[PDB]
Each structure stands twice: as structure tokens, then as C-alpha cells.
Structure 1
């Protein structure tokens, strides 16, 4: 299929501005292979283990809030967000749990 489709092919609700995705909603893309974008990283020589959630668009704060609600066992202070690239960082390894939560919707 062509990269630019015909004007009659596109619906009104597929365009930007519509469907109010810009306010308090979020989305996470799966990798080019079809897997969740949650990864483990080892930092500061290998003694600092973290979990990174990426390929996010929308409200990362809202995503963090919902993930916190679904994974209450993780202390609230262990979560951080890098806004310049919109990634969520969790102290420690929680790849399996975060994948278990995300796969229910994404």
C-alpha cells in the first residue's frame, strides 16, 4: 500500500486533533519484532539494575500512575520518568511484571 493514501481512504477519526489523544491518554508501541518495549539495564559498573519502558507516546505520568496501581508491590519512590525521551525507569528488575501488565492492553 502507498505511504500516502487517497483522501477517501482516511476516516475523520484517524486524523490528529480528533479523538482527544493529547489529553490524559497514552500508548506503547511494540518492537519491530512484535515484543513489549520493556528492558533490563545494568549501570554504574553492573551494580545498578533498572527496568526501562520505552516507545511511549501520550501521558507518561498517567501511564506511570496506572502501572503503579497495577504493580503496588513496587515502592512509589522507585519510579522515575525521563521526559526528553519519555521513558519510565524503575529501580530493580521488574521486566516480567511490567510485561504482564502491559500485554493486557498493548
Structure 2
């Protein structure tokens, strides 16, 4: 399993700059073991409960919109995304619901 494959082994769509990944597209990578990266965190002494999504490559905003379209029970203002690390934060505990949606495709 070489880290540098042969020049012939690679094909066009595996080269950065093709297949317009960075536009209107998002990919979420599973953890080392193979579980979805959705975790719950208790903050400020356990009083505040949040849900986080990590390992997001692409456009976080549209992934946020797509999830919002699938879980309309979570209010509009509960979602918040940090741009420094590309993490989507939900003001409640919705690890179960988000995992159900995410696994549908990823």
C-alpha cells in the first residue's frame, strides 16, 4: 500500500481541481474505527448540552442547510457553524437524529 501510486494508477477525477469538489459539495469522513463523527459535549459545568459534527471537507453551510431540511424539528437558530475548524454545532442533544440522516448517504 504505497503512499505514492504509479502515475498510470491514478485517473483524472482523483486529481485535485477536477470534479468541482469545493463548490456546492461536502464530504464527511468516518472516524478511525468507522463510526460517524457526531458527538455530544456538556459545557459550562454540565449545564449546557451541544452536538458537534467534525471531519467536514467542503462547504459547511450547505451541509448545514441540507441537515436543516431533513430535521425541521430543530429550530432555525439552534444551528451554528465555526469556520476555523468547519464544525456544525446544535444547541441541543441531537446525536441520534443527525447520525440517522448522515448515514443515509455517507
Settle same-fold status: TM greater than 0.5: yes
The list of structure 1 runs, each at least 4 consecutive aligned residues, that deviate by more than 3 angstroms after superposition, is: none
- Residues 55-94 of structure 1: pairs in structure 2 closer than 5 A: 55-94=55-94
Residue 42 of structure 1: how far off its partner (Å):
0.1
Residue 38 of structure 1: how far off its partner (Å):
0.1
For structure 2, the residue ranges without an aligned partner over 5 or more in a row are: none
1:6-51 Cα shifts (integer Å, max 9, x gaps): 0000001110010000101000000000000000000001000000
For structure 1, the residue ranges without an aligned partner over 5 or more in a row are: none
SS of equivalent residue, structure 1 residue 73: coil
TM normalised by structure 1 equals 0.99
Quick one: distance in 1 between partners of 2:54 and 2:27?
10
* Aligned Cα root-mean-square deviation (Å): 0.4
Q: Which residue number corresponds to residue 28 of structure 1?
A: 28
